[PDB]
Amino acid sequence: EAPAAVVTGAAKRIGRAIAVKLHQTGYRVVIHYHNSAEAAVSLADELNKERSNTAVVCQADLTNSNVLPASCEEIINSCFRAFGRCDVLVNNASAFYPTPLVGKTVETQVAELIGTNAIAPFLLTMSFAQRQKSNLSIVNLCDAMVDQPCMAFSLYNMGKHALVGLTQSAALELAPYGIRVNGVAPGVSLLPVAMGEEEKDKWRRKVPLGRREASAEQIADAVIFLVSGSAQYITGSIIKVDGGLSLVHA
Amino acid sequence: EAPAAVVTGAAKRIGRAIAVKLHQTGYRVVIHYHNSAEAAVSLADELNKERSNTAVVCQADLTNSNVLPASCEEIINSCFRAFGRCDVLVNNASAFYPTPLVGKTVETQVAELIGTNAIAPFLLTMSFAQRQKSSNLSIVNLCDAMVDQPCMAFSLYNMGKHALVGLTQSAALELAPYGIRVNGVAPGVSLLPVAMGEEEKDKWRRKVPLGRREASAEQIADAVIFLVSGSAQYITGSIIKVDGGLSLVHA
Amino acid sequence: EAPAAVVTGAAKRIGRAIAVKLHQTGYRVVIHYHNSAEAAVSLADELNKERSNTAVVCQADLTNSNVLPASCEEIINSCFRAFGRCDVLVNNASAFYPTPLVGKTVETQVAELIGTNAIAPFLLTMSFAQRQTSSNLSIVNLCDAMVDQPCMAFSLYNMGKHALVGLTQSAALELAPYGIRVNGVAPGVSLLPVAMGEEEKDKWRRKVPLGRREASAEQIADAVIFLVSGSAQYITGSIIKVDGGLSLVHA
Amino acid sequence: EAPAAVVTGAAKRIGRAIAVKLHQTGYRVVIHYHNSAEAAVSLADELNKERSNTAVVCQADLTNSNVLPASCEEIINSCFRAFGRCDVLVNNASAFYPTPLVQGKTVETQVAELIGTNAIAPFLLTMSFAQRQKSSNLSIVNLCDAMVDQPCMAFSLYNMGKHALVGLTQSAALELAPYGIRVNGVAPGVSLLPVAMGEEEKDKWRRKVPLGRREASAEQIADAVIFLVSGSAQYITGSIIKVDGGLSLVHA
Ligand SMILES: NC(=O)c1ccc[n+]([C@@H]2O[C@H](COP(=O)([O-])OP(=O)(O)OC[C@H]3O[C@@H](n4cnc5c(N)ncnc54)[C@H](OP(=O)(O)O)[C@@H]3O)[C@@H](O)[C@H]2O)c1
Ligand SMILES: NC(=O)c1ccc[n+]([C@@H]2O[C@H](COP(=O)([O-])OP(=O)(O)OC[C@H]3O[C@@H](n4cnc5c(N)ncnc54)[C@H](OP(=O)(O)O)[C@@H]3O)[C@@H](O)[C@H]2O)c1
Ligand SMILES: NC(=O)c1ccc[n+]([C@@H]2O[C@H](COP(=O)([O-])OP(=O)(O)OC[C@H]3O[C@@H](n4cnc5c(N)ncnc54)[C@H](OP(=O)(O)O)[C@@H]3O)[C@@H](O)[C@H]2O)c1
Ligand SMILES: NC(=O)c1ccc[n+]([C@@H]2O[C@H](COP(=O)([O-])OP(=O)(O)OC[C@H]3O[C@@H](n4cnc5c(N)ncnc54)[C@H](OP(=O)(O)O)[C@@H]3O)[C@@H](O)[C@H]2O)c1
Ligand SMILES: Nc1nc(N2CCSCC2)c2cc[nH]c2n1
Ligand SMILES: Nc1nc(N2CCSCC2)c2cc[nH]c2n1
Ligand SMILES: Nc1nc(N2CCSCC2)c2cc[nH]c2n1
Ligand SMILES: Nc1nc(N2CCSCC2)c2cc[nH]c2n1
Ligand SMILES: Nc1nc(N2CCSCC2)c2cc[nH]c2n1
Ligand SMILES: Nc1nc(N2CCSCC2)c2cc[nH]c2n1
Ligand SMILES: Nc1nc(N2CCSCC2)c2cc[nH]c2n1
Ligand SMILES: Nc1nc(N2CCSCC2)c2cc[nH]c2n1
Questions:
Q1: Chain C: residue whose CA lies nearest to D103
Q2: DSSP one-letter string for A130-198
Q3: Among A13, A61, C42, D195, which is least packed, fewest CB within 10 Å?
């Protein structure tokens, strides 16, 4: 019978492309979402049309708070309830906005940016590992530019840095259970509607390999590799999918 | 006129040695503490005996909470009330204990470990810089040389230190326009717990290529002094390992 | 037409497994060898028995010398000669032995360790690029996961693998405009040879968090295959560890 | 008795600044040079004028060849001959020029010069330095490059050389730690620019640096060297200190 995967922030964009490829590969998927309820439901419908009873949605705010552990336990619980198993966790959900050092409160920004990008991944990893009853693995969506951070994005960058540490820490600690933990680190990918042709072009032009952004599917391809039987000896690795962007000096 | 430094968790061990060396170098010091009031005050008294009116203490919990930003603002404000200036911020205070993946709730652990190691440093950096909006202004973060060879069951602590690395780098870039340098010192094995069995202390000591011993607090403090000095005025965004080669040792 | 690949040091062990997988995926292949001519030829016989005229062999010493550039050009030429195209280059050939700091001369060791691990890959890279719509051109360098926790007495080997990292990154940048991707695969402990003592083999195996075993040659090859595939077409400058977590383990 | 130091490529620019600062701290110095004989002799003159019998010059090509090991052994031997000891080695000499991957010197000469100076000579010097040893504070400092993981276009061999030197720094730190010899590095970003560089190209480099939009002075680089050799760095080994004013942290 078919393995099962949770993908956080899977309603749209990169998380959706990850959910789609996992499903094409034969996974049953939990499509987690926060605000994008319509897109989530529509994706589950599309996927269930392809193979019945292979997709469910699961709503949760991944902002840090005293109930985040419960929410994260519930996401994993929702995979077992629907599919009787949980083979793969993809930590993709992520808040992203500037927090300059010099109308959300600063503690709300901390809770959002650090919760989504780091604490929730940690709690989800905890619950995933504890619920284990095979090719089990976790893939974290990191950031190829983590050591060349954008100006005024401190809290975001801190979250992505903690996510690197979690990836390495959990790889080590979960290895005795046969659970692999790895990361995929995009550079410029699927820039959204709808920043100017200006700023999109400015970022696309930085990319040595083709002067273009990654497609969502290109990011998903690397996730697919890491969860596959072709990556069974791979744990604690973070694969840049950045067309060489992080190698480019000032 | 004499520059001033805030050192967090400065009552004991490594932070104390940092505050002593800064004081010996000519700084006035805010000795921040959480639970260690008696040692904090004892340090302040010793330093004030050396030079009157050069050391004050400041108490705060640096666990993450709704009140942390105001607590951090108060710490910076306190250096300005005492000394009229704040030249140097040393983020040293840190909670440290295991949080295995498989008394305290996990969200408390998050609050303490990510609060002390990362969020408090960030809020302190904001407040420090906001107050600055021949001066040699800088921040030094106490990191961890073993951050990419993490210890078993220390994921939250490790996550905290990794975030601290990101902060060190992001703030270096963002504050460079104000002449504020931001750097780190990354100990390997330094001061071991008093209560740790000497036999267990020795398993750690034996891992260190250089001398098969832990770093003194003073050796950690030496790197901090360098980073804040006029000899490091082009250095920002750098994290100096002070680890006796430990991080280079394979399994 | 079927794409073609050059694999250096392909007669045995990891290079053989890479050659076989590329061939299984539909590539024609040049099996480069230095001393292992019998094994290179049995490999080509096997592969050509599956699909005719799809494997050839090519001999060369990859030690640095006055003739190395010409040898490297000839390797790439052998692929164009045999197959009309060269889509993939896998730099796998590598000399490996200790060079303590305190009967080959030291300069012969420099030539072999740095030649095979760094200089020949640079020259092969030059010749590969010089010879070049819907193509998928890439280079994969066999690096080393333990490059920043190097083994005692292996400075020149380690220097060579460090230089290969540099090449991987420099070449990814410089060849990107040509559509040529350049990536690395970094084993930890893989296919420990028959020669080595079993207690020393067991020591290395026991260090590996994921299964306390070495990687098979096929496991290393899987990562190579991924990197040369259409599934990695936005990936350049990346080095993928295939090490079962070994590099993450502290002293 | 005063300690002694070898500084490679020390006749001018950063290497000079290092030798001068070491000398001011109380070291006797061997000023190595290759082609800049006049500048080297002029430096030794000044230092000797400050304290008699405290500087000597030593000529050597550090291009890789089968006699490079002898040449490096002789550099260390010259420090012992002049001063009776050798406490500090600074590996500063370096060839630097592009070597484009797609199309003067043959490529094998370019390999020998770029990889020789930046990596192999440091290795051989380190071997000889350790081999010649018996409150000592023995150390090696390697001049690295903060941009090593964001390399400049068409500088493959140079970058390979600097990467190899990182590996040496790390490997030698571990292997020489038992002898009390620390090995560390200093990694400039943009420091002293070429005389001939057009001030427009110079300003393009300057404007990249977050801390001050200016290049590091030679003294700023030397300051980090001096820290690493001092008693204030006695637990530090295997460490590479960027002196780059934030440049390596700046994205494309
Ligand atoms: N795009 C890039 O160029 C790029 C570059 C580097 C790294 N990455 C990383 O790659 C991953 C995917 O990137 P992306 O651009 O597709 O991400 P994105 O669109 O910015 O966000 C992905 C999803 O995260 C979810 N999310 C945000 N805040 C949340 C919260 N408080 N609780 C729960 N979920 C929340 C949202 O769900 P709802 O829509 O359901 O609210 C959102 O759709 C991210 O981890 C990102 O940081 C992307
Ligand atoms: N010792 C080592 O081997 C080692 C190794 C690697 C890195 N480091 C780093 O170097 C630094 C110094 O190490 P250390 O061993 O001296 O540190 P430590 O003794 O564990 O902690 C230093 C101080 O942190 C303060 N602290 C802890 N929790 C706090 C909270 N919730 N709010 C406010 N302050 C709090 C405490 O102050 P009170 O006592 O006043 O409560 C404590 O004395 C730390 O950042 C540490 O992570 C140390
Ligand atoms: N095995 C591991 O645990 C491990 C760990 C980390 C990294 N790696 C890397 O992964 C790659 C494959 O490892 P491996 O253990 O399979 O390699 P290996 O057996 O040591 O050597 C591979 C081949 O390299 C060729 N070679 C050696 N010296 C040469 C020279 N002077 N000129 C031309 N060719 C020469 C040999 O070809 P002939 O037999 O034809 O002479 C040899 O069969 C290497 O790059 C290695 O550094 C391996
Ligand atoms: N300048 C920068 O912005 C910068 C940036 C990053 C890193 N660095 C590093 O910092 C160090 C000093 O930089 P720099 O600009 O002062 O260096 P440099 O002037 O390019 O070179 C220093 C010396 O190296 C010696 N040298 C060159 N080729 C040689 C050979 N074949 N044999 C022996 N010696 C040779 C030369 O000695 P003679 O003049 O006597 O012939 C030269 O004076 C270098 O290791 C460099 O890579 C500098
Ligand atoms: N969560 C998230 N979204 C991102 N987006 C969506 C908002 S606009 C630009 C791409 C990026 C980009 C780099 N890291 C990111 N992380
Ligand atoms: N990897 C990445 N890309 C970024 N870009 C390009 C993708 S879309 C928005 C700006 C930013 C911005 C802040 N941190 C970032 N990290
Ligand atoms: N640098 C470092 N040292 C550690 N040691 C040695 C010092 S005292 C306690 C254990 C630990 C433990 C978890 N993370 C650590 N990081
Ligand atoms: N905050 C903190 N405390 C530490 N302690 C606890 C008090 S005494 C033994 C060291 C260590 C050790 C490595 N990283 C650490 N971080
Ligand atoms: N070229 C090469 N061969 C290796 N071999 C063959 C000889 S014995 C150990 C496996 C190893 C091992 C780590 N890096 C290596 N590189
Ligand atoms: N990755 C790796 N493995 C090594 N091992 C384990 C494989 S077989 C021989 C020792 C060594 C030895 C020196 N450099 C090495 N690098
Ligand atoms: N040996 C060396 N020389 C350099 N010089 C002197 C010649 S022209 C360019 C500046 C630079 C510059 C960056 N890394 C360098 N390494
Ligand atoms: N650190 C650094 N600076 C560079 N610059 C700035 C200083 S002067 C010459 C160009 C170059 C050039 C090639 N590799 C370099 N590395």
A1: C130
A2: HH----EEEEEE--TTTTSPPTT-HHHHHHHHHHHHHHHHHHHHHGGGTEEEEEEEESSB-PPTTS-HH
A3: D195
Domain extents for chain D? 1-252
**CB of D101 closer than 8 Å to CB of C166:** no
Question: Interface partners of D (3+ CB pairs, < 8 Å)?
Answer: A, B, C
Nearest to C155 by CA among C117, C201, C210, C207: C117
Task: Give the dihedral sign, CA C96/C99/C105/C111.
Answer: positive
Number of CB pairs < 8 Å for C and D?
A: 132
- Atom 9 (ligand 7) nearest CA: B192
Task: Render A89-149 in DSSP notation, one character per residue.
Answer: EEE--------------HHHHHHHHHIIIIIHHHHHHHHHHHH----EEEEEE--TTTTSP
d(CA D80, CA D133): 10
CB nearest to A114's CB, from B65, B114, B178: B114
Cα D105 to chain centroid distance, Å, stands at 24
User: How far apart, in Å, are the Cα atoms of A2 and each of A24, A78, B196, C55?
Assistant: 12, 16, 49, 39
Contacts of B108 (CB under 8 A, 6+ apart): none
Q: Residue B214 is which amino acid?
A: E
The number of the ligand nearest the C-alpha atom of D209 reads 12
Number of Cβ atoms within 10 Å of the Cβ of D139: 26
Catalytic residues of B: 144, 157
Q: Does domain D1-252 have CATH number 3.40.50.720?
A: yes
Structural contact between residues C54 and C23, judged by C-beta atoms closer than 8 angstroms: yes
B188 lines ligand 7 (CB under 6 A): yes
Is C186 an 8 Å CB contact of chain B? no
A63: left (phi over 0), alpha (psi -120 to 50) or beta: beta
Asked whether B7 and B121 are in contact (CB, 8 A), the reply is no
C198 Cβ neighbours under 8 A, 6+ residues apart: none
C-alpha–C-alpha distance, residues A29 and A83, integer Å? 9
Query: Would you identify the CATH topology of the domain B1-251?
Result: Rossmann fold (3.40.50)
Residue type at B83 in one-letter notation: F
Catalytic residue among A143, A147, A201, A221: A143
Beta strands in chain D (DSSP E): 4-7, 28-33, 55-59, 88-91, 139-143, 182-188, 240-243
Say if C215 is an interface residue toward chain A (CB within 8 Å). Answer: yes
| Rounded Cα–Cα distance for residues D59 and D74 (Å) | 10
Summarize chain B as % helix, strand, coil (round to 5).
50, 15, 35
**What was the experiment behind these coordinates?**
X-ray
- Straight-line distance from the first to the last Cα atom of chain A, in angstroms, rounded to the nearest whole number: 51
Ligand nearest to the CA of C150: 10
Q: Is D45 one of the catalytic residues?
A: no
DSSP state of D54: -
Round to whole Å and give the CA distance between C227 and C223.
Answer: 6
Taking an 8 Å cut-off on Cβ atoms, the answer to whether A168 and B150 are in contact is yes
Structure tokens at B14: 């490594």
CB of A250 within 8 Å of any CB in chain D?
Answer: yes
D125: three-class secondary structure by DSSP = helix
CA distance C89 to chain A (A): 18
Chain C contacts of D100, Cβ < 8 Å? Answer: 174
Length of chain C as a residue count: 251
Q: Name the residue type at position B229.
A: S
The answer to whether C53 contacts chain D (CB < 8 Å) is no
Q: What is the CATH number of domain A1-250?
A: 3.40.50.720
Taking only residues 125 to 184 of chain C, the set having a beta carbon closer than 8 angstroms to any beta carbon of chain A reads 169, 172-173, 176-177, 179, 181
Number of helices and strands in chain D (H, E):
8, 7
Q: A134-151: b or e for each residue (b if 16 or more CB lie within 10 Å)? A: eebbbbbbbbbbbbbbee
